[PDB]
Amino acid sequence: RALAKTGAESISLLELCRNTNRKQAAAKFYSFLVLKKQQAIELTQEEPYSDIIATPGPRFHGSLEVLF
């Protein structure tokens, strides 16, 4: 039941924030900062204000289905 919660190779922050309001979008941006601190993701941003892409980090992290 927990084994079937497969995921993607990358997560687009801008895709996550589609149809969100400003406070929701800010909270997702902030959660990316916290996940990076926890080494749960790696982050790339091609240039300032481009999309921000998360890929799996070197530490395991739980509850990533609700975080994404």
Partner 1 sequence: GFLKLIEIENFKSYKGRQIIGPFQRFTAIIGPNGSGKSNLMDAISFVLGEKTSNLRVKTLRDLIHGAPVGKPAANRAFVSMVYSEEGAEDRTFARVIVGGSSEYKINNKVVQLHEYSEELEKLGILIKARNFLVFQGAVESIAMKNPKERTALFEEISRSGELAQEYDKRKKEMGSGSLVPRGSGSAKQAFEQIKKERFDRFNACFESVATNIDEIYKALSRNSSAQAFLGPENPEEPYLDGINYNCVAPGKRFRPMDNLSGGEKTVAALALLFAIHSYKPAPFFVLDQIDAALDNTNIGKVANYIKEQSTCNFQAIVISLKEEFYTKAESLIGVYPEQGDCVISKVLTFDLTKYPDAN
Footprint (CB under 8 A) of partner 1, residues 4-63: 13, 17, 20-27, 29-30, 32-34, 36-37, 39, 43, 45, 48-49, 52
- The nearest distance, CB 57 to partner 1, in angstroms, is 10
| Residue 56 CB neighbour total at 10 angstroms | 16
| CA–CA separation, 27 and 54 (whole Å) | 15
For partner 1, the closer of residues 1 and 18 by Cβ is 18
- The nearest distance, CB 7 to partner 1, in angstroms, is 21
Q: Check if the beta carbon of residue 29 is closer than 8 Å to that of residue 13.
A: yes
